[PDB]
Each structure stands twice: as structure tokens, then as C-alpha cells.
Amino acid sequence: ARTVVLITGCSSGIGLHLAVRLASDPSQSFKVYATLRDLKTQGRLWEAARALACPPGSLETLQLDVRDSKSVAAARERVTEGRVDVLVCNAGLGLLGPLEALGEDAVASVLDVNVVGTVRMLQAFLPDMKRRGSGRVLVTGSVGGLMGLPFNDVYCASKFALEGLCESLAVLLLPFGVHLSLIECGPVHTSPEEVLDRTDIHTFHRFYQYLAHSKQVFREAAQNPEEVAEVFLTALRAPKPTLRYFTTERFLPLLRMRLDDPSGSNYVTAMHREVF
Amino acid sequence: ARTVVLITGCSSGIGLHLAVRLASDPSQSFKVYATLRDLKTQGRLWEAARALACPPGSLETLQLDVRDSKSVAAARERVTEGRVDVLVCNAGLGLLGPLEALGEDAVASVLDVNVVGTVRMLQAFLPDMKRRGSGRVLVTGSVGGLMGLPFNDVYCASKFALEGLCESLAVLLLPFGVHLSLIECGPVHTSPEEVLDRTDIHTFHRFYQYLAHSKQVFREAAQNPEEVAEVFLTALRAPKPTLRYFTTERFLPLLRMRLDDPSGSNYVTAMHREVF
Ligand SMILES: NC(=O)c1ccc[n+]([C@@H]2O[C@H](COP(=O)([O-])OP(=O)(O)OC[C@H]3O[C@@H](n4cnc5c(N)ncnc54)[C@H](OP(=O)(O)O)[C@@H]3O)[C@@H](O)[C@H]2O)c1
Ligand SMILES: NC(=O)c1ccc[n+]([C@@H]2O[C@H](COP(=O)([O-])OP(=O)(O)OC[C@H]3O[C@@H](n4cnc5c(N)ncnc54)[C@H](OP(=O)(O)O)[C@@H]3O)[C@@H](O)[C@H]2O)c1
């Protein structure tokens, strides 16, 4: 039988690229349920699917909004095979700006989608995997869940939360045969007036500096989503997958500095200088 | 003038002990606003305050429920001095059990109180600190925000989120004169039928094992809250405070193992063996 994959957030970026990479695999090993918060956004996915000649029936789209457990449960029921071999929790939101300029609703949304939405997926799909003694869970991670980034406080909070969620689950899941892995990505190729009204002029200036620095890092280091999507495939095919896969080695040095001074002083100084 | 301190979650545990330690300081240097989600729980705080002979006016209680920005803003307005020198974000919730047995509401609450509630406090109080070029923010942290613990998936998610939140803020706040620090605590001295209905028998058994192990760690290693509260004082008086203070060195070895194998495999195996 085919490996059934269900992926969240497939309208663009990594989830879209992974869905068509799997559905178009030359071996035809995978059946992919590409889920999207809003089905009106499915056009790029189908344009990409056609461009890679995904065979008819290799790819199916479902509406699945991870903020609603009813949407999660209805998409689970639509899996005609009655099982999910590979669950990919990829749906996510960014949030950028001075902490005091972020709306309360925008903050709550990032946490609900990024964190509670993955909890909702794991509650809905983990129990069947545990009973079967098999299944693979891949979660899209970020360098921002491993080290704090200025002006990405809430986004980072959310990615760090996924690290804690997944590591805690991994400790239990070790002898169940169910494998969880984070795919740690760096940058991937996928109004000033309102921010200034909500913060001070110095923070606003630092924000500009962050943004100029971010643009340069992206221009120099953003990876193609095909390259990132393939790390998911690598994790899927490992007989004994590790908790974390890194899509690049570029941030490891910073990571090691961070990890080697538990007071946090070396990291805070080094990252302040790197960005500003 | 006195150092004005506002602390969240003062009904018991660390926040209660810190509030009276500060209010009763022999130098009478601090004016403490001890805030509590529900004022009906203030009795132990006042019993402790009397036992340490806090001078009249050294300690004041305000209702402050970090889930509501209106409650945050009304308590801020009650600070008669018009400034907060030291803000202590300590309010928190635990959540223990099999991930599939946790209510959706209980999950959302842990994140809203532990993460969005600290964001709400920082939005309300950081701007005045930044304008003044001074102020200290202390956040109660946990060993669970530094490494994942089985059956504490959502709690850990929330503590890891605070690490990401605070580290991201610290990178920006470096040149503003506003100091943020996490106080990293280990264990501190502060129905089966329903869990079994929501999970499988094997997970339920592992849960028992976790709980027996947890009880032994607590019995052997829980620190007195006076000792933990004093680390907050240490951070407050440091001229150049670090991002993190540890209340104990007991988990550093585990922390270093975790940090030295970024694949996460060594930690997951070691912690599985430690608990089970
Ligand atoms: N791109 C990078 O530089 C980078 C780096 C490290 C990690 N990552 C991670 O990669 C994942 C995918 O992002 P991309 O692939 O990089 O970026 P992307 O295009 O932002 O992908 C995110 C996907 O999540 C979906 N989504 C948002 N809210 C959702 C909800 N409530 N329910 C279901 N789906 C929802 C988005 O769709 P709608 O917009 O239609 O809601 C979009 O399809 C994210 O978890 C992101 O954090 C990205
Ligand atoms: N105790 C440990 O073993 C340990 C270890 C590491 C870190 N910590 C951290 O220490 C902090 C304090 O806990 P303790 O001091 O250890 O435990 P605690 O007695 O649980 O303290 C938590 C305080 O948070 C309050 N709280 C809960 N929801 C709130 C809300 N919505 N608004 C305002 N306050 C709220 C609680 O009051 P109500 O119950 O009345 O809401 C209580 O006063 C927590 O952040 C905890 O994670 C504890």
C-alpha cells in the first residue's frame, strides 16, 4: 500500500513544495493529503502539481484550519485509507515588529496557530499511531525556535514552544514506535506609519536596522524550498530518525555559543552585534 | 525613593515568598505591589507579611489577572508612584498528563496565562522603562523551559516559549538600560479514572512511572522558596545582570548533554532512562 501523508499549511512555501515533491515521487509510494486553511488558496498547489506531473489520485486537497478542532476532525475523517503514516505539522505564522506595537489578537493568533494548532493535530492523530506502533511525525521547525531573534519575540516564543512540545513528546514516544522529528530551517525562498505610532523613535530605528540586516541575510543565505523539502524526505526514510534535522549548518556555530554559555550573556552580545 | 516592585501571581509559592521577602527587607528599600488573579486568595500573603513584620505601606495587593489586558492596565494605573523599577513576571500554570488527555481549553489557558500574559505585562510596562532608560524585568523560568519533560508537553511548550520571548527581547534591550533576566528554577517546595478514559493503557502506565519518579525527585531535590526567592534579589542587585540565573546547578549536566548533541538523540535517550 502507499504511504499516506497528511500535511498542514500547503498553500505556499515549504508545505506546497513538500506536498508536490511527495505526490510526484517517481516511485509513486506516497498518497498526499495537502491541507490548507482556506481552499480558495489552492491554485498554486495545483499549478505546481501539474508542473511535476503528479499522477491523478496522488494528491488530494482538504480544508483544514488548525485553529479549529472541528476542522481538524473533519479532515481526519476524509482520509479514506483510515490511517496516516506520515503527519507533517507545517502550518505557521510569522509576526514581526516591536513587542509593544503588536496587536493582542495577532499575538494570540500566532500562538494558537503555531502551538495550539500542532497540539490539536497531535491529539487527533497520535492515538492511532500509538495503537498501531508506527507512524512518523514531522514538524517544521526554525532557527528562531533554537535562538532568540530581535523583533521576532512572539514568533520565536512560538517556535521555541514547538521545540519544548516535541522534545517532551519524544521522551515518551521512544518505545512506542512513533517517531517525531523537527526539521530546522534557516531562511527559505518562499506600514512604517503604524509601527512608528506604536513605539518610540529609537526602537523604530533599531527595527529598520534589523530589517536591513534581515534582507541581507535572506539575499545571501535563503535556501530553495526544494532543498528544504528534501530534508523532510531524508527524515522520513531514516530507519531511526533523530529528534532534529538541520536544513543548513550555517547557524550551528551561533547555536553552540548560545548553548555553551547558559547565562545567555555571550549569545545576547554576539547576536546584538550581528544584527546591529 | 523606594524601589517600586510589581509582581504577578502572589497568592502562593515563589511570588508570595518574594513579595514578603522584599517588603520585609531590613533596609526598607522596596515598595511592593503584590498582585493576584483573585483577591479572595490573599490571606496567606497577609499571614506571611505579618509573620515577617512587613512595615505598613511596604506591601499592597492589587487584583491582576494576566489573561485580561484591562486588568493589567487597571493595576498599572494603581501604582501611585507612576513608575515600576522592578517588574516580576511570575504568574504561571502547570499542566500534567498524556497530551491526548488534556482539554483544549486547559491547553489554551496554559499558553494564555504563561506566554500571552507575560507579553501583556511587557507591553504595558516596558515602554515606560525604555523611555526612562532604566528598569529590571525578572521572569520566573523553569528547568522545563530548557529541556523537555515527558507528560509536561504543554507546560514545557509554554516555558520554552518564555525563553524565546525573553532572549529575543534581551537582544534588543541591551543598549536601552532595561535589564531582563530569567530565574531558572528546578523543583521548589510550594482523577486516574478520567486520565485512563482519555488515553491508552500503556501511556497510562508510563504516566504512573513518570509520577513516581517525579515524587522522588521532588522529595530529594525540592528547594525552599526562601532560597529561590533570594536568587531574584541577587539578580536585582547585579549592576549588569545576565539573561539567566540558575537556582541550582543540579540540572546543568543534563542541560549540557542536551546542548552538545543538537540532533536531540542523546537527551531523548538519557531522559527516557532517567524517568522510566
Ligand atoms: N520561510 C522561512 O524563512 C522559514 C524559516 C524557518 C521555518 N519556517 C517555517 O516553515 C513553515 C512554512 O512556511 P514557508 O513554508 O516557509 O512559509 P509560509 O508560506 O508562511 O507557510 C505557512 C503555511 O501555513 C499556513 N497557515 C497559516 N495559518 C494556518 C492555519 N490557521 N491553518 C492551516 N494553515 C495555516 C499558510 O497559509 P495561509 O497564509 O493561507 O494561512 C501557509 O500555507 C512555517 O511553520 C514556518 O515557520 C519558514
Ligand atoms: N514550583 C516548582 O516546582 C517550579 C519550578 C520551576 C518554575 N516554577 C514557576 O514558579 C512560578 C510560581 O509558581 P510557584 O511559585 O512555584 O507555584 P504556584 O503556587 O503555582 O505559583 C503560581 C502563581 O501564579 C498565579 N496565577 C495563575 N493564573 C494566574 C493568572 N491568570 N493571573 C495572575 N496570576 C495567576 C497562581 O495563582 P492562582 O492559582 O490563584 O491563579 C499562583 O499565585 C510559576 O511561573 C512556575 O512555573 C515553579
Q: Is A175 among the annotated ligand-binding positions?
A: no
Name residues whose C-beta falls within 8 Å of residue A35's C-beta, 6 or more positions apart in sequence: A6, A7, A8, A9, A10, A61, A62, A63, A64, A75
The residue segments making up the domain with residue A66 are 1-276
Would you tell me how many other CB atoms lie within 10 Å of the CB of residue A220? Answer: 9
Strand-pairing partners, residue A246, are A184
CA angle A254, B116, B227 (to 5 degrees): 75
Give chain B as a DSSP string: -PEEEEES--SSHHHHHHHHHHHT-TT--EEEEEEES-GGGTHHHHHHHHHTTPPTTSEEEEE--TT-HHHHHHHHHT-TTS--SEEEE-------S-GGGS-HHHHHHHHIIIIIHHHHHHHHHHHHHHHHT-EEEEEE--GGGTS--TT-HHHHHHHHHHHHHHHHHHHHHGGGTEEEEEEE---B---HHHHHHHS-HHHHHHHHHHHHHHHHHHHHHPBPHHHHHHHHHHHHH-SS--SEEES-STTHHHHHHHHH-TTSHHHHHHHHHHH-
Q: Report the SS3 class of residue A76.
A: helix
Chain A and chain B share a number of CB contacts under 8 A equal to 228
Please tell me the distance between residue B37's alpha carbon and the centre of ligand 2 in angstroms. Answer: 10
Candidate from B154, B168, B262 with C-beta closest to A156: B168
Phi-psi region of B129 (alpha: psi -120 to 50; beta: other; left: phi over 0): alpha
**Do residues A110 and A159 make contact, with C-beta atoms less than 8 angstroms apart?**
no
What's the rounded Cα separation, in Å, for the pair B264 and A174?
12
Q: Taking the mean position of all CA atoms in its chain, how far away is CA A140? A: 3
**Which chain A residues are Cβ-neighbours of B99 within 8 angstroms?**
119, 122-123, 126, 169
- C-beta of B14 in contact with ligand 2 (< 6 A): yes
**Do residues B66 and B113 make contact, with C-beta atoms less than 8 angstroms apart?**
yes
Is B210 designated active site? no
Q: Taking the mean position of all CA atoms in its chain, how far away is CA B234? A: 16
Phi-psi region of A126 (alpha: psi -120 to 50; beta: other; left: phi over 0): alpha
Q: Nearest chain A residue to B235 by CA: give it.
A: A263
**Ligand nearest to C-alpha A145:** 1
Please tell me the distance between residue A186's alpha carbon and the centre of ligand 2 in angstroms. Answer: 35
From residue A122, give the alpha-carbon distance in Å to each of A41, B82, B224, B253, B263: 24, 46, 37, 31, 21
* Documented resolution in Å: 1.8
What's the rounded Cα separation, in Å, for the pair B75 and A266?
36
CATH number of residue B11's parent domain: 3.40.50.720
Strand-pairing partners, residue B179, are B136
Give A172-199 as a DSSP string: HHGGGTEEEEEEE---B---HHHHHHHS
Indicate the pairing of strand B135-140 with strand A30-36: unpaired
Name residues whose C-beta falls within 8 Å of residue A49's C-beta, 6 or more positions apart in sequence: A19, A20, A23, A24, A59
Q: Give the residue from A257, A266, A148 showing the smallest Cα distance to B165.
A: A148
Q: Taking the mean position of all CA atoms in its chain, how far away is CA A3? A: 21
Q: Do A108 and B107 touch (CB under 8 A)?
A: no
Which residues 16-35 of chain B have a CB within 8 Å of chain A?
Answer: none
Which helix H or strand E contains A5, and what residues bound it? strand A3-7
DSSP A206: H
What's the rounded Cα separation, in Å, for the pair A267 and A150?
12
Q: In this structure, what are the phi and psi dihedrals at residue B180, rounded to the nearest 5 degrees?
A: -115, 135
Q: Measured between CB atoms, does B99 come within 8 Å of chain A?
A: yes
Tell me which method was used to determine the 3D structure. X-ray
How far is A51 from chain B, CA to nearest CA, in Å?
35
Q: End-to-end CA distance of chain B: give it in Å, rounded.
A: 53
* Secondary-structure breakdown of chain A: helix, strand, coil percentages, each rounded to the nearest 5: 55, 15, 30
Q: Report the SS3 class of residue A242.
A: coil
What's the rounded Cα separation, in Å, for the pair B157 and B98?
14
What's the rounded Cα separation, in Å, for the pair B110 and A37?
25
Q: Of A160, A163, A166, A206, which to mutate for an interface test with B (greatest number of B Cβ within 10 Å)?
A: A160
Q: Give the residue from A83, A88, A86, A94 showing the smallest Cα distance to A35.
A: A88
- Length reported for chain A: 276
Candidate from A99, A176, A182 with C-beta closest to B169: A99
Q: Which residue has 510589581 as its cell numbers?
A: B6
Ligand 1 surroundings by CB, under 6 angstroms: A 8-15, 37-38, 41, 65-67, 90-93, 113, 140, 142, 185, 187-188, 190
**Do residues B272 and B261 make contact, with C-beta atoms less than 8 angstroms apart?**
no
Name residues whose C-beta falls within 8 Å of residue A106's C-beta, 6 or more positions apart in sequence: A95, A154
Please tell me the distance between residue B187's alpha carbon and the centre of ligand 2 in angstroms. Answer: 12
Q: Which residue has 539578580 as its cell numbers?
A: B235
E-assigned strand segments in A198-253: 244-246
**Do residues A66 and A117 make contact, with C-beta atoms less than 8 angstroms apart?**
yes
Would you tell me how many other CB atoms lie within 10 Å of the CB of residue B93? Answer: 16
Name residues whose C-beta falls within 8 Å of residue B187's C-beta, 6 or more positions apart in sequence: B217, B218, B221, B222, B223
Catalytic annotation, pick one of B155, B210, B245, B267: B155
Long-range contacts of A163-166 (CB under 8 A, 24+ apart): A163/B148, A163/B160, A164/B144, A164/B145, A164/B148, A164/B153, A164/B156, A164/B157, A164/B158, A164/B159, A164/B160, A164/B161, A165/A115, A165/A118, A165/A119, A165/B148, A165/B153, A165/B154, A165/B156, A165/B157, A165/B160, A166/A139, A166/A243, A166/B148
Would you tell me how many other CB atoms lie within 10 Å of the CB of residue A53? Answer: 10
Would you tell me how many other CB atoms lie within 10 Å of the CB of residue A226? Answer: 12
Domain count, chain B: 1
**Do residues A198 and A100 make contact, with C-beta atoms less than 8 angstroms apart?**
yes
DSSP A129: H
What's the rounded Cα separation, in Å, for the pair B241 and A180?
37
Q: Give the residue from B35, B266, B249, B31 showing the smallest Cα distance to A167.
A: B266
What's the rounded Cα separation, in Å, for the pair A112 and A130?
25
From residue B261, give the alpha-carbon distance in Å to each of A138, A159, A241, B156, B257: 19, 19, 14, 19, 7
What's the rounded Cα separation, in Å, for the pair B4 and B42?
20
What's the rounded Cα separation, in Å, for the pair A11 and A162?
21
Q: Give the residue from B268, B151, B147, B153 showing the smallest Cα distance to B210.
A: B151
H helical segments located in A78-199: 104-111, 117-132, 153-173, 192-198
Which residues 189-248 of chain B have a CB within 8 Å of chain A?
Answer: 199-200, 202-203, 206, 242-246
Which residues 111-150 of chain B have a CB within 8 Å of chain A?
Answer: 111-112, 115-116, 119-120, 122-123, 126-127, 130-131, 144-145, 147-150
- Breaks, C-N > 2.5 A, in chain B lie after 190
Q: Do B107 and A122 touch (CB under 8 A)?
A: no
Please tell me the distance between residue A92's alpha carbon and the centre of ligand 1 in angstroms. Answer: 4
